[PDB]
Amino acid sequence: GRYPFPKDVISMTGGWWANPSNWKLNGLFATGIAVGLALWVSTATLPYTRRREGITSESDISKWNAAAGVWRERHGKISTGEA
Amino acid sequence: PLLSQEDMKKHKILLAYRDRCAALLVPLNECRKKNYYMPWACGHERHEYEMCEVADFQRRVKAMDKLKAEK
Amino acid sequence: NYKWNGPLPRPHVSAGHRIATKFLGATMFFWMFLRIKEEYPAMLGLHNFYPP
Amino acid sequence: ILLSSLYLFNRILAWQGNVKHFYLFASNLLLLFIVVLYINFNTFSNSFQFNFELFNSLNPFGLSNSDISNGLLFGIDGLSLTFILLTVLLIPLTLLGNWYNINFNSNLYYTLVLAIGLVILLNFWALDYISFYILFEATLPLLFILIHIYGSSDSERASFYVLMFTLSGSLFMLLSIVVISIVLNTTNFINHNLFVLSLDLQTIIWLGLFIAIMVKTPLFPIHVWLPVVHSESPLAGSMILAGLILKLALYAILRLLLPLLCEAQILYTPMIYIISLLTIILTSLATLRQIDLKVIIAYSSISHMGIAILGVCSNTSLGIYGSIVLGVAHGFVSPALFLIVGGILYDRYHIRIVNYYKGLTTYMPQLATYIIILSFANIGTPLTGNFTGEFLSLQGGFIRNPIIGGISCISVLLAAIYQLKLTNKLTGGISSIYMHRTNDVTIREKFIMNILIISTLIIGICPQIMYNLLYWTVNNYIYII
Amino acid sequence: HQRPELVSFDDINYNDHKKVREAQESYTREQFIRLEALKTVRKALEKCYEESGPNHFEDCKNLAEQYLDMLPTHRLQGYLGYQRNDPSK
Amino acid sequence: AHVLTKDMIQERIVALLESFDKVNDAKNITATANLTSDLGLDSLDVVEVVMAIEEEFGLEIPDHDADEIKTVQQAIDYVSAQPAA
Amino acid sequence: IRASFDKAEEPMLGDYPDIDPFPAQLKNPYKKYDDQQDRRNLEEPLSVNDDLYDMWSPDRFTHFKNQDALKYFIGFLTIFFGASYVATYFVPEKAAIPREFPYEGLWKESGGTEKSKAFFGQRS
Ligand SMILES: CCCCCCCCCCCCCCCCCC(=O)OC[C@H](COP(=O)(O)OCCN)OC(=O)CCCCCCCCCCCCCCCCC
């Protein structure tokens, strides 16, 4: 069941069977802070979100690969296993 | 009919799936996308691709039969 | 715990737990039956894909 | 100003009788002053900025504007600024951690502590070999006196160790510094990479410099003085020694050795890697069979310094940045662990034997939480600066030599072993029968430990915040043709 | 935005410290620019890969080969190697 | 939860001994009865009894203590002294 | 006294009790002790290598001897690995040839180039 425990021991977890007499009002405060933090961050991190594909166009991709080939030709660059 | 290289890229077929009938893979994957990969749906397309793979594996077992016969 | 070294009484179990047991067992058996019926050829192994 | 401030000091002493409030105030002012300096520090330049010269012949007692410079040079770049900020952060906490447990000759004790802190802070400002060496040795008399008077039972032997081992290394450092002085006739750090000594002479000078580095870091096999000196030092001595004086070694490598003896360093690097792998593996293993709390915490520092060395001689930007970050994180974490073992447990029970301690969670849950957090920080949990330092140092070491760095990756495991083996016994089990219940950690102790924890966490989640001071340094010392 | 003038170790007399500092800083800054080029390459490769998926090989071969090529050459190498050695002799 | 009372212990022990066969008699079993003397149990039979008692109350008796109990009162008090019974 | 490492320390003690060490885990747990969890009474002498014999020491198991347990461990591993390796020989052959792909094994699609088709490219 239960047993005696030293009352002077203060732990931020509450200690033994912590069940404060005003726990419902502190609970209202806690849930208010919870919704506030969750909503604030959900909105704040919204601009840093994006999808994986469809961000750039095929134009950019193909032109970048072509530019990379141009670079590899200006230098003397064979391909992997091309030997 | 064997798919065009361009078509096969355009549909973004996986490399291991790119075979003589990725042609039936394309509609099957489109159906599987419209429905939410639910088991009961896409039955016809799923069966169609499987029947490809039947013919496909069949030519393979015959090729191994011929190879075996040579020895 | 009235009786010791003696035959035990029939256990008392809540109505809800018996009803939950009946539902779970009925559902599992019925689902298994449905699955075997629907997949019998493929799960048992039939229609060999090799050429005859 | 100085006259007036001296008057203020005298009056405060006469009326209050204990200097320690004045010293705390002073050190806080010094911290604020250094922060102001950081504000006004230009980071888009690899040049020393707040220069001044002392004991020049034209003005022995003031600053020199002469066209001949024969005094001692001082000034800072980003690399010095980082460690200076660490120092001014640590000093007030060092004063505060002994706020109540010194009840005799207390004014002298606080004077010695503040003097040692100021000496190290000034040492980081030094810009030439001679002044660097002067302030590098100036601590030894203060440490000797402090440990001898305010130390634990075995403090006499501790004081003799801390003086003798460091002198032993410093005199070979002095041989190297004398050779440089007579060969170049210059001593400065500003332009000493411009002088290219013959390879043989570089190889000879490097020996004296690196012997000093072996004793001071320490490295295997001459590390045996550190565990003693730590265990019998008072709390301020231990915190200073672990958090600043060891980093003086790493700063010594980067400032005195690498820019001048580049080619000889390239020749000698595998020997350095042998010695660092030795120190890591062997000291980490030897930590398993210790029975004293402060001795175990002391042994942890040697292994972390071994990883730091492996980083700093890796000839890669990542290795050097990792060594610096690891030094800073160690300066945050190790003083906290020393605070625990030698200021909380030792001031409550006046014993350091491990067998007495067990199950501290029941009466002191807060102390147990602090122990858990600090130990997982010490063994290198990510989002702590220690992890960033060890990871980057190991990257540099693996690049410089794949086999040696790959083997050195065993430090993660070894550190976990000794540290968690300690904290397992300390926190859990049934409360010890040998000791009685005492108070939980107080407001002052919690304040110090919170400062250290938040510092290490801040640089652990975003280690980039140090880069603005160090992006020149990570290129100033690597030798690639 | 500052664009300090570029200086080389080869031209300068090492006895004017201002010029020597400028040469050291210029060399470092050029190394950092080279790094930026490497990172631009890598970011383009990441976008290429993420949008090409299964055919990323064909689509991104050029970028992948170029990134793998610039990796060993576009890191930091520090100025001490080149100021302390004259490559001519 | 579940808590036992001294009388419950005694009742269980009495029933235990009642069902044991090598006993002399069932009616003669007293609270202060000696198994060795009154019930005439063998050297090993009291051993069997202590094993039965530990198996019944779900405890474990060390060797030095099992042989110490000689009367049923000793057994009841011993079983009541153990918290997890 | 019993173990080699404790015997090694006998010259290194002068006027300290040469204790025979007994694993505290093997001390039967029904005796009473001043510290029940550590099964130690107050002022009991400590062996020089105590830290290897207290309760916090790595657990020791009594069922098999250490050497015997080693024999069993190595035996299980050897029999398993050897049986598997020998079983590799008595293996049936498959029935269908491995699959193939168009365009000389799609060597274009897995990167590849005309000059190097062996590195990248399927069975075709
Ligand atoms: C016993 C060991 C061996 C002793 C050897 C050396 C002993 C030295 C004694 C300490 C004296 C050094 C501290 C004071 C010198 C700096 C005074 C100063 O004015 O700084 C000069 C510098 C440039 O100033 P300026 O050119 O005049 O331009 C001003 C523009 N408004 O202005 C600046 O840029 C500001 C510079 C800040 C310097 C910070 C110094 C940190 C610590 C200060 C006190 C240290 C006292 C040490 C005591 C223990 C002994 C080491």
Buried b (16+ CB within 10 A) or exposed e, F42-60: eeebbeebbeebeebbeee
Chain E residues touching A61 at Cβ < 8 A: 47-48, 51-52, 59-60
Q: Using CA positions, which residue lies closest to atom 3 of ligand 1?
A: D135
Q: Using CA positions, which residue lies closest to atom 47 of ligand 1?
A: D118
Inter-chain touch D366–A12, beta carbons under 8 Å: yes
Instruction: State the CB neighbour count (10 A cutoff) for residue A78.
Output: 12
The pocket around ligand 1, CB under 6 angstroms, is made up of D 50, 52, 54, 63, 115, 118-119, 121-122, 125, 134-135, 138
Mutate to test the interface with A, among D370, D427, D436, D440 (most CBs of A within 10 A): D440
Residue A56 CB contacts under 8 Å (≥ 6 apart), including other chains: E47, E51
User: How close does chain D come to E82, measured CA to CA in Å?
Assistant: 6
For residue D128, the cross-strand partners are D188
Residues in chain G: 124
The phi and psi torsions of F66 (rounded to 5 degrees) equal: -60, -50
Q: For residue D121, how far is its CA from the centre of ligand 1 (angstroms)?
A: 10
Deposited resolution, Å: 3.4
Burial class (CB in 10 A: 0-12, 13-18, 19+), B31: middle
Q: What share of chain B is helix, strand, coil (3-state, %, to 5)?
A: 70, 0, 30
The closest of D141, D134, D93, D86 to D115, measured between CA atoms, is D141
List the structure tokens of E73: 């050459």
The closest of B20, B68, B52, B21 to G97, measured between CA atoms, is B68
Instruction: Spell out which chain A residues touch chain E, with contact meaning CB-CB distance below 8 angstroms.
Output: 52-56, 60-62, 64-69, 71-72, 75, 77, 79-80
Atom of ligand 1 nearest to the CA of D72: 6
| 3-class DSSP string for G60-102 | CCCCCCHHHHHHHHHHHHHHHHHHHHHHHHCCCCCCCCCCCCH
Pocket test for ligand 1, best of D122, D137, D244 (most atoms within 8 A of CB): D122
Q: For residue D453, how far is its CA from the centre of ligand 1 (angstroms)?
A: 31
Contact D240, D301 (CB under 8 A): no
Q: What is the DSSP letter of D340?
A: I
Based on the structure, what is the number of domains in chain E?
1
| 3-class DSSP string for E24-78 | HHHHHHHHHHHHHHHHHHHHHHHHHHHHHHHHHHHHHHHHHHHHHHHCCCCCCCC
Contact D377, D371 (CB under 8 A): no
The CA-based angle G44-G50-G56, given to 5 degrees, is 100
Residue A35 CB contacts under 8 Å (≥ 6 apart), including other chains: none
Separation of CA D196 from chain center:
31
Chain F residues touching C5 at Cβ < 8 A: 15-16, 18-19
Atom of ligand 1 nearest to the CA of D119: 51
Residue D241 CB contacts under 8 Å (≥ 6 apart), including other chains: D143, D162, D229, D230, D233
Contact B25, B8 (CB under 8 A): no
The phi and psi torsions of D172 (rounded to 5 degrees) equal: -70, -35
Asked if omega into D218 is within 30° of 0 (cis), the reply is yes
Asked if omega into D221 is within 30° of 0 (cis), the reply is yes
Separation of CA D242 from chain center:
5
List the structure tokens of D409: 């990756």
Q: What's the Rg (C-alpha) of chain C?
A: 23
Cα dist from D388 to D228, D380, D404, whole Å? 29, 8, 19
Query: CB-hemisphere CA count at 13 Å for G118?
Result: 4
State whether the Cα torsion D314-D317-D319-D324 is positive or negative. positive
Based on the structure, what is the number of domains in chain C?
1
List the structure tokens of D175: 């041989």
User: How close does chain G come to D288, measured CA to CA in Å?
Assistant: 10
Separation of CA F17 from chain center:
7
Helix (H) or strand (E) holding G8: helix G4-8
Q: For residue D68, how far is its CA from the centre of ligand 1 (angstroms)?
A: 20
Query: Does residue B18 belong to the interface with chain G, where contact is any CB pair within 8 Å?
Result: yes
Cα dist from G37 to D428, G24, G32, whole Å? 11, 10, 10
Residue D472 CB contacts under 8 Å (≥ 6 apart), including other chains: D45, D46, D77, D78, E28
Q: How far apart are CA B22 and CA B8, in angstroms?
A: 8
Task: Please list the active-site residues of F.
Answer: 42
Cα dist from D410 to D275, D298, D404, whole Å? 16, 20, 11
Inter-chain touch A9–D369, beta carbons under 8 Å: no
Q: How far apart are CA D48 and CA D51, in angstroms?
A: 7
Instruction: State the CB neighbour count (10 A cutoff) for residue C28.
Output: 10
Instruction: Find tokens 């490559």 and name the residue.
Output: E87
Mutate to test the interface with B, among E50, E51, E55, E59 (most CBs of B within 10 A): E55
Q: How far apart are CA C20 and CA C26, in angstroms?
A: 10
Residue D439 CB contacts under 8 Å (≥ 6 apart), including other chains: D348
Cα dist from D192 to C42, D126, D187, D478, F84, whole Å? 82, 14, 8, 15, 79
Cα dist from D39 to D36, D78, D249, E79, G109, whole Å? 5, 12, 27, 28, 56
User: How close does chain D come to A42, measured CA to CA in Å?
Assistant: 21
Mark out the alpha helices in D313-442 (DSSP H runs).
Answer: 317-339, 346-349, 365-378, 385-400, 402-408, 411-427
Cα dist from D16 to D11, D12, D21, D107, D391, whole Å? 8, 6, 9, 11, 50
For chain E, how long is the longest CA-to-CA vector? 60
Torsion (CA) D398, D402, D403, D408 in degrees, nearest 10: 10
User: How close does chain A come to E31, measured CA to CA in Å?
Assistant: 19
Contact D261, D204 (CB under 8 A): no
Contact E77, E30 (CB under 8 A): no
Query: Does residue A73 belong to the interface with chain G, where contact is any CB pair within 8 Å?
Result: no
Mutate to test the interface with D, among G56, G57, G59 (most CBs of D within 10 A): G56
Q: How far apart are CA G19 and CA G17, in angstroms?
A: 6
Burial class (CB in 10 A: 0-12, 13-18, 19+), D476: buried
Q: What's the Rg (C-alpha) of chain F?
A: 12
Start-to-end C-alpha separation, chain F: 13
Q: For residue A17, how far is its CA from the centre of ligand 1 (angstroms)?
A: 58
Query: Does residue B54 belong to the interface with chain G, where contact is any CB pair within 8 Å?
Result: no
Q: How far apart are CA D480 and CA E4, in angstroms?
A: 24
Q: How far apart are CA F57 and CA F15, in angstroms?
A: 13
Residue numbers after which chain A is interrupted (C to N above 2.5 A) read none
Contact E6, E33 (CB under 8 A): no
Q: For helices E56-70 and E17-52, what crossing angle results, to 10°?
A: 160
Chains A and E touch (3+ CB pairs under 8 A): yes
**Strand, helix or coil for residue D188:** strand
**Strand, helix or coil for residue E42:** helix
Chains C and F touch (3+ CB pairs under 8 A): yes
Domain ranges within chain F, ordered by starting residue: 1-85
For residue D292, the cross-strand partners are D353
The closest of D340, D318, D319, D322 to D330, measured between CA atoms, is D322
Cα dist from D247 to D79, D158, D305, D381, F74, whole Å? 12, 20, 9, 21, 70
Q: How far apart are CA D453 and CA D443, in angstroms?
A: 15
Contact E66, A68 (CB under 8 A): yes
Q: For residue E25, how far is its CA from the centre of ligand 1 (angstroms)?
A: 28
Contact D252, D212 (CB under 8 A): yes
Strands (E), B1-71: none
Contact D231, D297 (CB under 8 A): no
Contact E83, E25 (CB under 8 A): no
The phi and psi torsions of D74 (rounded to 5 degrees) equal: -140, 145
Mutate to test the interface with G, among B4, B7, B13, B18 (most CBs of G within 10 A): B18
User: How close does chain G come to B31, measured CA to CA in Å?
Assistant: 25
The closest of E34, E1, E8, E76 to D44, measured between CA atoms, is E1
Instruction: State the CB neighbour count (10 A cutoff) for residue D24.
Output: 17
Q: How far apart are CA D146 and CA D143, in angstroms?
A: 5
Query: Does residue A81 belong to the interface with chain G, where contact is any CB pair within 8 Å?
Result: yes
Q: How far apart are CA A81 and CA G118, in angstroms?
A: 8
Give the type of residue at D370. Y
Parallel/antiparallel/unpaired status of strands D52-54 and D72-74: antiparallel
List the structure tokens of D239: 């915190």
Pocket test for ligand 1, best of D52, D119, D130 (most atoms within 8 A of CB): D52
List the structure tokens of A50: 């994006």
By C-alpha distance, the chain C residue nearest B62 is: C51
**Strand, helix or coil for residue F34:** strand
Instruction: State the CB neighbour count (10 A cutoff) for residue E26.
Output: 17
List the structure tokens of D326: 């690891």
Q: Which domain holds residue E6?
A: 1-89
Q: What's the Rg (C-alpha) of chain D?
A: 22
Domain ranges within chain B, ordered by starting residue: 1-71
Residue A23 CB contacts under 8 Å (≥ 6 apart), including other chains: none
Query: Does residue C3 belong to the interface with chain F, where contact is any CB pair within 8 Å?
Result: no
User: How close does chain D come to A11, measured CA to CA in Å?
Assistant: 6
The closest of D274, D267, D276, D251 to D202, measured between CA atoms, is D267
Cα dist from G53 to B62, D362, D423, G4, G66, whole Å? 70, 26, 19, 14, 17
Contact D302, D246 (CB under 8 A): no
Start-to-end C-alpha separation, chain C: 71
Cα dist from B11 to C50, D130, D132, E55, G101, whole Å? 31, 73, 69, 10, 18
Instruction: Find tokens 């099992």 and name the residue.
Output: F66
The closest of G103, F13, D432 to G112, measured between CA atoms, is G103
Instruction: State the CB neighbour count (10 A cutoff) for residue D88.
Output: 21
Residues in chain B: 71
| 3-class DSSP string for chain C | CCCCCCCCCCCCCCHHHHHHHHHHHHHHHHHHHHHHHHHHHHHHCCCCCCCC
**Strand, helix or coil for residue B2:** coil
Q: Which domain holds residue C24?
A: 1-52
The phi and psi torsions of E8 (rounded to 5 degrees) equal: -115, 150
Atom of ligand 1 nearest to the CA of D134: 3
Separation of CA D228 from chain center:
17
The closest of D207, D210, D171, D176 to D192, measured between CA atoms, is D176
Residue D316 CB contacts under 8 Å (≥ 6 apart), including other chains: D395, D396, D399, D400, D478, E76
Chain A residues touching G118 at Cβ < 8 A: 81
Inter-chain touch A61–E59, beta carbons under 8 Å: yes
Residue D252 CB contacts under 8 Å (≥ 6 apart), including other chains: D132, D136, D209, D212, D213, D216
Q: How far apart are CA D316 and CA A15, in angstroms?
A: 50
Q: What share of chain E is helix, strand, coil (3-state, %, to 5)?
A: 65, 0, 35
Q: How far apart are CA D244 and CA D83, in angstroms?
A: 8
Instruction: State the CB neighbour count (10 A cutoff) for residue G73.
Output: 11
Contact D411, D389 (CB under 8 A): no
Residue E1 CB contacts under 8 Å (≥ 6 apart), including other chains: none
The closest of D236, D210, D214 to D226, measured between CA atoms, is D214
Helix (H) or strand (E) holding A40: helix A23-44
Chains D and B touch (3+ CB pairs under 8 A): no
Instruction: State the CB neighbour count (10 A cutoff) for residue A16.
Output: 14
List the structure tokens of B68: 């075996």
Query: Does residue E78 belong to the interface with chain D, where contact is any CB pair within 8 Å?
Result: yes
List the structure tokens of D178: 């004398």
Q: Which domain holds residue D256?
A: 1-481
